[PDB]
Coordinates of C-alpha atoms and ligand atoms in Angstrom, one line a residue:
Chain A
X1 CA 20.7 6.8 -21.6
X2 CA 17.1 5.9 -19.9
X3 CA 18.3 3.2 -16.7
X4 CA 14.2 1.5 -15.9
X5 CA 14.5 -0.5 -12.8
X6 CA 11.1 -2.5 -11.1
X7 CA 10.4 -3.2 -7.4
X8 CA 7.8 -5.0 -6.0
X9 CA 7.5 -8.2 -6.5
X10 CA 7.5 -12.0 -4.9
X11 CA 5.0 -14.4 -4.6
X12 CA 2.0 -14.3 -3.7
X13 CA -1.4 -17.4 -3.2
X14 CA -3.6 -17.5 -6.1
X15 CA -6.3 -15.3 -6.4
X16 CA -4.1 -12.9 -4.6
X17 CA -3.2 -9.4 -5.7
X18 CA 0.6 -7.1 -6.0
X19 CA 1.5 -3.7 -7.0
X20 CA 4.7 -3.4 -9.6
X21 CA 6.3 -0.7 -9.7
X22 CA 9.3 1.0 -11.9
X23 CA 11.2 3.7 -12.1
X24 CA 13.1 6.0 -14.9
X25 CA 15.7 7.6 -15.4
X26 CA 17.8 9.8 -18.5
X27 CA 16.7 11.4 -20.8
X28 CA 13.4 9.8 -21.8
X29 CA 11.9 13.0 -24.0
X30 CA 8.2 13.5 -23.6
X31 CA 6.2 10.4 -25.7
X32 CA 6.3 7.1 -26.2
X33 CA 5.5 4.0 -24.8
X34 CA 5.9 2.7 -21.4
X35 CA 5.1 -1.4 -20.7
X36 CA 5.1 -4.2 -18.7
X37 CA 6.2 -7.7 -20.2
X38 CA 6.7 -11.2 -18.2
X39 CA 9.6 -13.9 -18.9
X40 CA 6.9 -16.7 -17.8
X41 CA 8.4 -20.3 -16.9
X45 CA 8.2 -12.8 -23.0
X46 CA 4.9 -11.5 -23.8
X47 CA 3.8 -8.3 -23.7
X48 CA 1.3 -7.4 -20.7
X49 CA 0.2 -4.1 -20.4
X50 CA 1.3 -1.0 -21.9
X51 CA 0.7 3.1 -21.9
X52 CA 1.3 5.4 -24.7
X53 CA 1.7 8.9 -23.3
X54 CA 1.7 11.5 -26.3
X55 CA 3.2 14.8 -24.0
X56 CA -0.3 16.9 -24.9
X58 CA -2.8 13.0 -23.9
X59 CA -2.2 9.2 -23.5
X60 CA -3.3 5.5 -24.6
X61 CA -3.7 2.5 -22.4
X62 CA -3.3 -1.2 -23.6
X63 CA -4.0 -4.7 -22.3
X64 CA -3.0 -8.3 -23.2
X65 CA -6.2 -9.9 -23.5
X66 CA -5.4 -12.6 -20.5
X67 CA -5.3 -10.1 -18.1
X68 CA -7.9 -7.3 -19.5
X69 CA -9.9 -6.8 -16.4
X70 CA -7.5 -8.4 -13.7
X71 CA -4.5 -5.9 -14.1
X72 CA -4.0 -2.1 -14.7
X73 CA -0.8 0.2 -15.5
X74 CA -1.0 3.6 -14.1
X75 CA 2.1 6.2 -13.5
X76 CA 2.8 9.0 -11.6
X77 CA 4.4 11.3 -14.4
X78 CA 5.3 13.8 -10.9
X79 CA 7.8 10.6 -8.9
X80 CA 8.3 9.0 -12.4
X81 CA 7.4 6.1 -11.2
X82 CA 4.8 3.3 -13.6
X83 CA 3.0 0.5 -11.2
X84 CA 1.2 -2.3 -12.1
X85 CA -1.7 -3.4 -10.3
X86 CA -2.4 -7.0 -10.4
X87 CA -5.8 -8.8 -8.7
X88 CA -7.3 -12.2 -9.0
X89 CA -3.9 -13.6 -9.4
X90 CA -3.6 -17.2 -11.3
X91 CA -0.6 -19.7 -11.8
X92 CA -0.4 -18.2 -15.1
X93 CA 0.7 -15.4 -14.4
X94 CA 3.4 -15.9 -13.1
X95 CA 7.2 -14.9 -14.2
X96 CA 10.1 -12.6 -14.7
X97 CA 7.8 -9.0 -15.0
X98 CA 10.5 -6.4 -16.5
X99 CA 9.4 -2.9 -17.4
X100 CA 10.0 -1.9 -21.1
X101 CA 10.1 1.7 -22.8
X102 CA 10.7 3.6 -26.1
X103 CA 9.8 6.7 -28.1
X104 CA 8.5 4.7 -31.4
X105 CA 6.6 0.8 -31.8
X106 CA 4.3 -0.7 -34.5
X107 CA 2.8 -3.5 -31.8
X108 CA 2.9 -1.9 -27.9
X109 CA 3.1 -5.9 -27.1
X110 CA 6.7 -6.4 -28.6
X111 CA 9.5 -7.1 -27.3
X112 CA 11.5 -6.4 -30.4
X113 CA 10.7 -2.4 -30.7
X114 CA 11.9 -1.7 -27.0
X115 CA 15.6 -0.2 -26.5
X116 CA 15.2 0.1 -23.0
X117 CA 14.9 -2.4 -20.2
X118 CA 14.6 -3.4 -16.6
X119 CA 15.7 -6.2 -15.1
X120 CA 12.5 -7.5 -13.8
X121 CA 11.2 -8.7 -10.9
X122 CA 10.1 -12.1 -10.2
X123 CA 6.3 -13.1 -9.4
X124 CA 5.5 -16.1 -8.2
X125 CA 1.8 -17.3 -7.6
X126 CA 0.6 -20.6 -5.8
Chain B
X1 CA -22.6 -1.2 7.7
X2 CA -20.2 -0.7 4.1
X3 CA -18.3 1.9 5.2
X4 CA -15.7 3.8 2.7
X5 CA -13.1 6.2 3.7
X6 CA -11.0 8.0 1.6
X7 CA -7.3 9.2 1.5
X8 CA -4.1 11.1 -0.3
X9 CA -6.1 14.5 -1.3
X10 CA -3.6 17.8 -0.3
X11 CA -2.6 20.8 -2.8
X12 CA -0.7 20.8 -5.7
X13 CA 1.0 23.4 -8.7
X14 CA -1.3 22.6 -12.0
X15 CA 0.6 20.8 -14.1
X16 CA 1.0 17.9 -11.1
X17 CA 0.3 14.6 -9.7
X18 CA -1.6 12.8 -6.7
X19 CA -2.3 10.0 -5.5
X20 CA -6.3 9.1 -3.8
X21 CA -7.3 6.0 -1.8
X22 CA -10.8 4.4 -0.7
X23 CA -10.7 1.7 2.1
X24 CA -13.8 -0.4 2.3
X25 CA -15.0 -2.7 5.2
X26 CA -18.6 -4.2 5.8
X27 CA -20.8 -6.2 4.2
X28 CA -20.3 -5.1 0.1
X29 CA -20.9 -8.6 -1.4
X30 CA -19.1 -10.0 -4.4
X31 CA -20.5 -7.7 -7.2
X32 CA -21.0 -3.7 -8.6
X33 CA -20.3 -0.3 -8.4
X34 CA -17.0 1.2 -7.0
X35 CA -16.7 4.9 -8.1
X36 CA -15.0 8.8 -7.5
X37 CA -17.6 11.3 -7.3
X38 CA -16.4 15.5 -6.9
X39 CA -17.9 17.8 -6.2
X40 CA -17.4 21.6 -5.4
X41 CA -18.8 24.1 -3.1
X42 CA -22.3 24.0 -4.5
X43 CA -22.3 22.8 -7.5
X44 CA -23.4 18.8 -8.1
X45 CA -21.5 15.7 -7.8
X46 CA -19.5 14.8 -11.0
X47 CA -18.8 11.2 -12.2
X48 CA -14.9 10.8 -12.1
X49 CA -14.6 7.5 -12.9
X50 CA -15.8 3.6 -12.0
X51 CA -15.5 0.0 -11.6
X52 CA -17.5 -2.5 -12.0
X53 CA -16.2 -5.6 -11.0
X54 CA -18.4 -9.3 -11.2
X55 CA -17.8 -12.3 -9.5
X56 CA -14.5 -13.1 -10.4
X58 CA -12.9 -9.4 -13.2
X59 CA -13.4 -5.3 -13.7
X60 CA -14.3 -3.0 -16.4
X61 CA -13.7 0.7 -16.1
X62 CA -15.3 4.0 -16.9
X63 CA -14.0 7.6 -16.9
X64 CA -15.2 10.7 -17.2
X65 CA -14.7 12.7 -20.6
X66 CA -13.0 15.4 -19.1
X67 CA -10.8 13.0 -16.9
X68 CA -10.1 10.8 -19.3
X69 CA -6.0 9.6 -20.3
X70 CA -5.2 12.3 -17.5
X71 CA -6.6 10.2 -14.3
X72 CA -6.3 6.3 -13.9
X73 CA -8.8 4.6 -11.5
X74 CA -7.6 1.0 -10.4
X75 CA -8.2 -1.0 -7.0
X76 CA -6.2 -3.7 -5.1
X77 CA -8.9 -6.4 -3.9
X78 CA -6.8 -7.7 -0.8
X79 CA -6.3 -4.0 0.6
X80 CA -10.0 -3.7 0.0
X81 CA -8.7 -0.1 -1.6
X82 CA -10.0 2.0 -4.7
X83 CA -7.1 4.5 -6.2
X84 CA -7.0 7.6 -8.6
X85 CA -3.9 8.7 -9.9
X86 CA -3.9 11.5 -11.2
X87 CA -2.2 13.7 -13.9
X88 CA -1.7 16.3 -16.0
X89 CA -3.8 18.0 -12.6
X90 CA -6.0 21.2 -13.9
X91 CA -7.1 24.0 -11.3
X92 CA -10.6 22.6 -12.8
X93 CA -9.5 19.7 -11.1
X94 CA -10.1 21.2 -7.8
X95 CA -13.2 19.6 -5.5
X96 CA -13.8 17.4 -2.6
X97 CA -13.3 13.6 -3.8
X98 CA -15.3 11.3 -2.4
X99 CA -15.9 7.6 -3.2
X100 CA -19.0 5.3 -3.5
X101 CA -20.2 1.8 -4.1
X102 CA -23.3 0.2 -4.8
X103 CA -24.4 -3.2 -6.1
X104 CA -26.6 -1.8 -8.6
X105 CA -26.6 1.4 -10.7
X106 CA -28.4 1.9 -14.2
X107 CA -25.4 4.2 -15.3
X108 CA -21.4 4.4 -13.9
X109 CA -22.0 8.3 -13.2
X110 CA -25.0 8.6 -11.7
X111 CA -24.4 9.4 -7.9
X112 CA -28.1 9.5 -6.5
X113 CA -27.6 5.0 -7.4
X114 CA -25.0 4.7 -4.9
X115 CA -25.7 3.6 -1.4
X116 CA -22.5 3.9 0.6
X117 CA -20.3 7.1 0.2
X118 CA -17.4 8.2 2.1
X119 CA -16.8 11.8 3.7
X120 CA -14.4 12.7 1.0
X121 CA -10.9 13.8 0.7
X122 CA -10.3 17.6 -0.8
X123 CA -8.2 18.7 -4.0
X124 CA -6.9 21.6 -4.6
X125 CA -5.1 22.3 -7.5
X126 CA -3.4 25.6 -7.8
Chain C
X1 CA -4.1 -4.6 12.2
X2 CA -3.7 -1.2 12.1
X3 CA -4.3 0.6 9.6
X4 CA -3.1 5.0 9.1
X5 CA -4.9 6.6 6.2
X6 CA -3.3 10.7 5.7
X7 CA -4.3 13.0 3.4
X8 CA -4.1 16.9 3.2
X9 CA -0.6 18.2 2.8
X10 CA 0.9 19.6 -0.1
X11 CA 2.5 22.6 -2.1
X12 CA 1.9 26.1 0.0
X13 CA 4.2 29.4 0.2
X14 CA 5.8 30.3 3.5
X15 CA 3.9 31.7 6.0
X16 CA 0.8 29.9 4.4
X17 CA -0.9 26.9 6.9
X18 CA -1.9 23.1 6.0
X19 CA -4.1 21.3 7.3
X20 CA -3.1 17.4 8.1
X21 CA -5.3 14.1 8.8
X22 CA -4.9 10.9 9.5
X23 CA -7.7 8.4 10.0
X24 CA -6.7 5.5 12.0
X25 CA -8.6 1.8 11.4
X26 CA -7.8 -1.8 13.0
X27 CA -7.2 -2.8 16.4
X28 CA -5.5 -0.2 18.2
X29 CA -6.4 -0.6 22.1
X30 CA -7.0 2.0 24.1
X31 CA -4.0 3.6 25.3
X32 CA -0.8 4.5 23.6
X33 CA 0.9 7.7 21.6
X34 CA -0.4 8.7 17.7
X35 CA 2.7 11.0 16.5
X36 CA 3.0 13.3 13.4
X37 CA 7.4 12.5 12.1
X38 CA 9.0 14.2 9.3
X39 CA 10.7 12.0 7.1
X40 CA 13.3 13.5 4.6
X41 CA 15.5 11.3 2.1
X45 CA 12.5 10.8 10.7
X46 CA 12.4 13.6 13.8
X47 CA 9.7 13.8 15.6
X48 CA 7.0 16.5 15.2
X49 CA 4.2 16.8 17.4
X50 CA 2.8 13.9 19.0
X51 CA -0.7 13.3 21.8
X52 CA -0.5 10.5 24.4
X53 CA -4.2 9.0 25.5
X54 CA -4.9 7.5 29.2
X55 CA -7.7 6.0 28.6
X56 CA -9.3 7.4 31.9
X58 CA -7.9 12.3 29.0
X59 CA -4.5 13.5 27.0
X60 CA -1.0 14.4 27.2
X61 CA 0.8 16.8 24.3
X62 CA 4.0 17.2 23.0
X63 CA 5.8 19.5 20.5
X64 CA 9.3 19.4 19.1
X65 CA 10.6 22.9 19.8
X66 CA 11.0 23.9 15.7
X67 CA 7.0 23.6 15.6
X68 CA 5.5 25.0 19.2
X69 CA 3.5 27.7 18.3
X70 CA 2.9 27.5 15.5
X71 CA 1.8 23.3 14.4
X72 CA -1.2 22.2 16.4
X73 CA -2.3 18.2 16.9
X74 CA -5.7 17.4 18.2
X75 CA -7.4 14.3 17.6
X76 CA -11.2 13.1 16.9
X77 CA -11.5 9.8 19.0
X78 CA -15.9 9.9 18.0
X79 CA -14.3 9.8 14.8
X80 CA -10.8 8.3 15.3
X81 CA -9.0 11.1 13.2
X82 CA -5.8 12.9 13.8
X83 CA -4.7 16.2 13.1
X84 CA -2.0 18.5 12.7
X85 CA -2.1 22.2 12.3
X86 CA 0.3 23.8 10.3
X87 CA 0.3 27.6 10.6
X88 CA 2.8 30.0 9.4
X89 CA 4.9 27.8 7.1
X90 CA 8.1 28.1 6.5
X91 CA 11.0 26.2 4.0
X92 CA 12.0 23.9 6.1
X93 CA 9.4 22.4 7.0
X94 CA 9.3 21.0 4.1
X95 CA 9.3 16.9 4.0
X96 CA 7.2 13.7 4.1
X97 CA 4.6 13.8 6.7
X98 CA 4.1 10.6 9.0
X99 CA 1.4 9.4 11.2
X100 CA 2.7 6.8 13.3
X101 CA 1.1 5.3 16.6
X102 CA 2.1 2.9 19.2
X103 CA 1.1 1.8 22.4
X104 CA 4.4 2.2 24.7
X105 CA 7.7 4.3 23.8
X106 CA 10.5 5.1 25.6
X107 CA 9.8 9.0 24.2
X108 CA 7.0 10.2 22.0
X109 CA 10.2 11.2 19.3
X110 CA 11.2 8.0 18.7
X111 CA 10.5 6.5 16.2
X112 CA 12.1 3.5 16.0
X113 CA 9.7 2.5 18.8
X114 CA 6.4 2.9 16.5
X115 CA 5.2 -0.3 14.5
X116 CA 2.2 1.2 12.7
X117 CA 2.7 3.8 10.5
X118 CA 1.1 6.0 7.7
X119 CA 2.1 5.7 3.5
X120 CA 2.8 9.7 4.3
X121 CA 2.0 13.6 3.0
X122 CA 3.8 15.4 1.3
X123 CA 4.1 19.0 2.3
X124 CA 6.4 21.1 0.0
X125 CA 6.7 25.4 1.2
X126 CA 8.8 27.4 -1.4
Chain D
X1 CA 4.6 -2.3 2.0
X2 CA 5.0 -6.3 2.6
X3 CA 2.6 -8.7 2.1
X4 CA 3.0 -11.8 3.8
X5 CA 0.9 -15.0 3.5
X6 CA 0.8 -18.6 5.5
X7 CA -0.3 -22.2 4.3
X8 CA 0.4 -25.1 5.6
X9 CA -1.9 -25.3 8.6
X10 CA -5.2 -28.0 9.3
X11 CA -6.4 -30.2 12.0
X12 CA -3.4 -33.0 12.7
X13 CA -2.6 -35.8 15.5
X14 CA -0.2 -35.8 18.0
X15 CA 2.8 -37.4 16.7
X16 CA 2.4 -35.7 13.9
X17 CA 3.9 -33.6 10.9
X18 CA 3.2 -30.4 9.5
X19 CA 5.1 -28.3 7.3
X20 CA 3.8 -24.8 7.3
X21 CA 4.5 -21.8 4.6
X22 CA 4.7 -18.2 4.4
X23 CA 4.8 -16.5 1.2
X24 CA 6.6 -12.8 0.8
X25 CA 5.6 -9.9 -1.3
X26 CA 6.6 -6.6 -1.8
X27 CA 9.5 -4.2 -0.8
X28 CA 11.2 -5.7 2.5
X29 CA 15.0 -4.5 1.9
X30 CA 17.6 -7.1 2.1
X31 CA 18.2 -7.2 6.0
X32 CA 15.8 -8.3 9.2
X33 CA 13.9 -11.1 10.6
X34 CA 11.8 -13.1 9.5
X35 CA 9.8 -15.1 11.8
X36 CA 6.9 -17.7 12.9
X37 CA 4.7 -16.8 16.3
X38 CA 1.5 -18.7 17.3
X39 CA -1.5 -17.2 19.1
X45 CA 1.3 -14.4 20.6
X46 CA 4.8 -16.6 21.3
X47 CA 7.9 -16.6 19.9
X48 CA 8.5 -19.8 17.6
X49 CA 11.2 -19.5 15.7
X50 CA 13.1 -16.8 13.4
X51 CA 15.8 -15.9 11.3
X52 CA 17.7 -13.3 10.2
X53 CA 18.9 -12.7 7.6
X54 CA 22.5 -9.9 7.1
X55 CA 24.1 -8.0 4.3
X56 CA 26.6 -10.1 3.5
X58 CA 24.1 -15.3 6.0
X59 CA 21.8 -15.5 8.5
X60 CA 21.7 -17.0 12.1
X61 CA 18.1 -19.2 13.0
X62 CA 16.5 -19.0 16.5
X63 CA 14.4 -21.2 18.3
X64 CA 12.2 -21.2 21.6
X65 CA 13.3 -24.0 23.9
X66 CA 9.5 -25.8 24.0
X67 CA 10.1 -26.4 20.1
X68 CA 13.9 -26.8 19.6
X69 CA 14.3 -30.8 18.2
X70 CA 10.8 -30.5 16.9
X71 CA 11.2 -27.4 14.3
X72 CA 13.0 -26.4 11.8
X73 CA 12.7 -22.4 10.2
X74 CA 14.3 -22.4 6.7
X75 CA 14.0 -20.1 4.5
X76 CA 14.2 -20.4 0.6
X77 CA 15.6 -16.6 -1.1
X78 CA 14.3 -17.3 -4.5
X79 CA 10.6 -18.6 -4.6
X80 CA 10.3 -15.5 -1.1
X81 CA 9.2 -18.8 1.3
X82 CA 9.9 -19.1 4.7
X83 CA 9.0 -22.5 5.9
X84 CA 8.3 -23.8 9.3
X85 CA 9.1 -27.7 9.7
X86 CA 6.9 -29.4 12.7
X87 CA 7.4 -33.1 13.6
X88 CA 6.2 -34.7 16.4
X89 CA 3.4 -32.0 17.4
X90 CA 2.2 -32.0 20.9
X91 CA -1.3 -30.7 21.8
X92 CA 0.2 -27.6 22.8
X93 CA 1.4 -26.9 19.4
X94 CA -2.2 -25.6 19.1
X95 CA -3.0 -22.4 17.1
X96 CA -2.8 -19.7 15.0
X97 CA 0.3 -19.9 13.1
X98 CA 1.6 -16.2 12.2
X99 CA 4.5 -15.3 10.1
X100 CA 6.0 -11.9 10.1
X101 CA 8.8 -9.6 9.0
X102 CA 10.4 -6.7 10.2
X103 CA 13.7 -4.9 9.3
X104 CA 15.3 -4.2 12.7
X105 CA 14.3 -6.1 15.9
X106 CA 15.9 -5.7 20.3
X107 CA 14.9 -9.6 20.6
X108 CA 13.5 -11.9 17.7
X109 CA 10.3 -13.0 20.1
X110 CA 8.9 -10.1 20.8
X111 CA 6.0 -9.8 18.8
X112 CA 6.1 -5.9 19.5
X113 CA 9.0 -5.3 17.0
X114 CA 7.5 -6.8 14.1
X115 CA 6.0 -4.8 11.2
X116 CA 4.1 -6.6 9.0
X117 CA 2.5 -9.4 9.8
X118 CA 0.1 -12.7 7.5
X119 CA -3.1 -13.2 8.6
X120 CA -2.0 -16.6 10.0
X121 CA -3.0 -20.5 9.6
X122 CA -4.4 -22.6 12.5
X123 CA -2.7 -25.4 13.5
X124 CA -5.0 -27.8 15.8
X125 CA -3.3 -30.9 17.1
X126 CA -5.5 -33.5 18.7
Ligands
HCY1 C1 6.8 7.0 -22.2 C2 8.4 8.3 -21.8 C3 9.1 8.8 -23.0 C4 9.5 7.2 -24.3 C5 10.5 6.5 -23.4 O1 11.4 5.9 -24.1 C6 11.1 6.5 -21.7 C7 9.7 6.7 -21.0 C8 9.1 6.4 -19.6 C9 8.2 7.5 -19.1 C10 7.7 9.0 -19.5 C11 7.9 9.1 -20.9 C12 7.5 10.1 -21.2 O2 5.9 9.5 -21.6 C13 7.4 11.8 -20.6 C14 7.4 11.2 -19.5 C15 5.5 10.5 -18.6 C16 7.6 9.8 -18.3 C17 7.7 9.8 -17.2 C18 6.9 11.5 -16.5 C19 7.3 12.6 -18.1 O3 8.9 12.7 -18.0 C20 6.6 13.8 -17.6 O4 5.3 13.3 -17.3 C21 6.6 14.5 -19.1 O5 5.6 15.6 -18.9
HCY2 C1 -17.7 -3.2 -5.5 C2 -17.8 -3.9 -4.8 C3 -20.0 -4.8 -4.5 C4 -20.7 -3.2 -4.3 C5 -21.0 -2.8 -2.8 O1 -21.4 -2.7 -2.4 C6 -19.2 -2.4 -2.8 C7 -18.1 -2.5 -3.4 C8 -16.6 -2.4 -2.9 C9 -14.9 -3.1 -2.9 C10 -16.1 -4.2 -3.6 C11 -16.7 -4.7 -4.0 C12 -17.3 -6.6 -4.5 O2 -16.8 -6.1 -6.0 C13 -16.1 -7.4 -4.1 C14 -14.5 -6.4 -4.0 C15 -13.7 -7.0 -5.2 C16 -14.6 -5.5 -3.4 C17 -13.0 -5.3 -3.0 C18 -12.3 -6.4 -3.0 C19 -13.4 -7.8 -2.9 O3 -14.2 -7.6 -2.0 C20 -13.4 -8.6 -3.4 O4 -12.2 -9.1 -4.2 C21 -14.3 -9.8 -3.1 O5 -13.7 -10.9 -4.5
HCY3 C1 -3.6 6.5 21.2 C2 -4.6 4.7 20.1 C3 -3.4 3.7 20.9 C4 -2.2 3.2 20.1 C5 -2.0 2.9 19.2 O1 -1.4 1.9 18.9 C6 -2.8 3.2 18.1 C7 -4.1 5.1 18.8 C8 -4.0 5.6 17.7 C9 -6.2 5.8 17.7 C10 -6.3 6.0 19.4 C11 -6.0 4.5 20.6 C12 -6.2 4.8 21.4 O2 -5.7 6.1 22.8 C13 -8.2 4.8 21.6 C14 -8.5 5.9 21.1 C15 -8.3 7.1 21.7 C16 -8.5 5.5 19.7 C17 -9.2 6.8 18.8 C18 -10.2 7.3 19.8 C19 -9.6 6.1 20.8 O3 -10.4 4.2 20.4 C20 -11.0 6.0 21.8 O4 -11.4 7.1 21.7 C21 -11.2 5.0 22.5 O5 -12.1 5.3 23.7
HCY4 C1 13.7 -10.2 6.2 C2 13.6 -9.9 5.3 C3 14.1 -8.3 5.4 C4 13.3 -7.9 6.5 C5 11.2 -7.6 6.0 O1 10.6 -6.7 6.4 C6 10.9 -8.5 5.1 C7 11.8 -10.1 5.4 C8 11.4 -11.4 4.2 C9 12.2 -12.2 2.9 C10 14.0 -11.9 2.9 C11 14.0 -10.1 3.4 C12 15.3 -9.8 3.4 O2 16.1 -10.2 4.0 C13 15.5 -10.6 2.0 C14 15.5 -11.8 1.4 C15 15.7 -13.0 2.4 C16 13.8 -11.8 2.0 C17 13.9 -13.6 1.2 C18 14.8 -13.4 -0.8 C19 15.4 -12.3 -0.1 O3 14.8 -10.7 -1.0 C20 16.9 -12.1 -0.8 O4 17.1 -13.2 -0.7 C21 17.7 -10.8 -0.4 O5 19.2 -11.9 -1.2

């Protein structure tokens, strides 16, 4: 029922910036995890837990301080802002969501996935 | 030399969302604080959120009153600072001004900031 | 080269007032059109032509006498003062600029655009 | 929305070769023009249709330059052979969803900063 669709990716030079988006539709309920994963040439990049009351955000150590996850709730859109891009950031960036997760960064805890948007860092 | 220009302000219903932007130009140097302050008529400026950027990577700071509702981010290639607001409350109403400085002992001390934009108004009804 | 930054929209009741602003930066040149368009999921609302020596102002018939366009050349800012707002004024209002245009309201001739500010009149 | 970044330029002797690259990212849509300009003269462009492409060259570079694009890598190439001194310039890539004349720079909505080519 929950549908996720990513956009905004592409090819960028090392050191560059990029902002990815993912739109959500369907009966999500009010609380859960909304996350970005990357499949490089499937690791958790960043995630936000929305409590439905506030919010908690998590980052992978390799992107801390370079990436920012945010969301516009009125627009049902999740964002991944990327700065200081490195070649090892290359991959298919997929958004995922779930009502319940133990590890925010474990892909198998997520029940809804988008197809992804490719990011290739020169 | 450093110039800051905010945009994206507007009117919103309580519970709504809004994203502010600020573009910088000029000789900033590579390191320092980039912050959002808010001020209502007759009130003192209150630090909302800030980032500290090092020579490389950034750290982020939030006022307790906006934590978990506002998110600060920047796009360095676009020289732009963002404030994503969600779950807006009437008490978030104010003139939102972006500020920057190479040097600040504490992120929320407006007296330490050296460049200021004119601001963009956010009204929450 | 040219960047357009908008502000000032949002929610208001019918009969209300809103004041849109757009700040321009970059290499614009000295003459041309500076316009407001409204986009629903782009029709011209108002524009100014600056000949760089005085200006001329243009309005869509449906906003004449309710909206006023003005510009501060010192602050490089364009304003749209919207009084007596009606529900049909609802839309995404985007600023646009161009050196040449066959008609002020022909958005296809405008190459520089702002992201938009949403205006919702209940 | 659309971010274009060129690379591959520099200083080269007449008669030499160079391959410029431009990477694109962001929400582009599926159809439009992707072009190389030198400064502002149209050098070469490719139109990609919804189906699948059409390519155009300035008369002064026909038979010497080739434009191509790797759609999987979101990269536009300008292969320059038999370079001449009048090819010197700042080569900028541009893109747009629609244009009447592929070579008219004023019709393009997105621009890169460019890569300099100096032919001695
Ligand atoms: C993570 C979440 C719940 C768990 C899930 O499987 C899918 C998602 C992604 C979208 C999130 C959603 C909930 O948190 C409520 C949210 C924030 C929504 C976007 C807008 C929203 O509907 C609200 O803001 C409700 O007020
Ligand atoms: C806080 C800072 C330094 C202190 C100052 O007075 C003004 C600013 C705001 C813009 C920041 C800048 C530096 O950090 C370098 C930054 C990040 C820049 C935006 C893009 C940038 O120029 C770079 O990314 C260069 O690497
Ligand atoms: C429409 C125009 C030229 C065409 C274009 O693509 C972008 C714009 C909007 C900003 C205008 C500009 C020119 O007219 C010169 C202006 C008025 C400028 C704001 C202040 C200005 O720079 C001056 O007043 C210079 O005297
Ligand atoms: C010219 C175009 C559309 C108009 C625009 O402002 C930016 C460009 C450059 C990149 C092109 C794009 C579209 O044509 C779809 C393309 C080909 C894309 C490269 C890979 C692509 O996304 C696809 O291959 C879709 O199948």
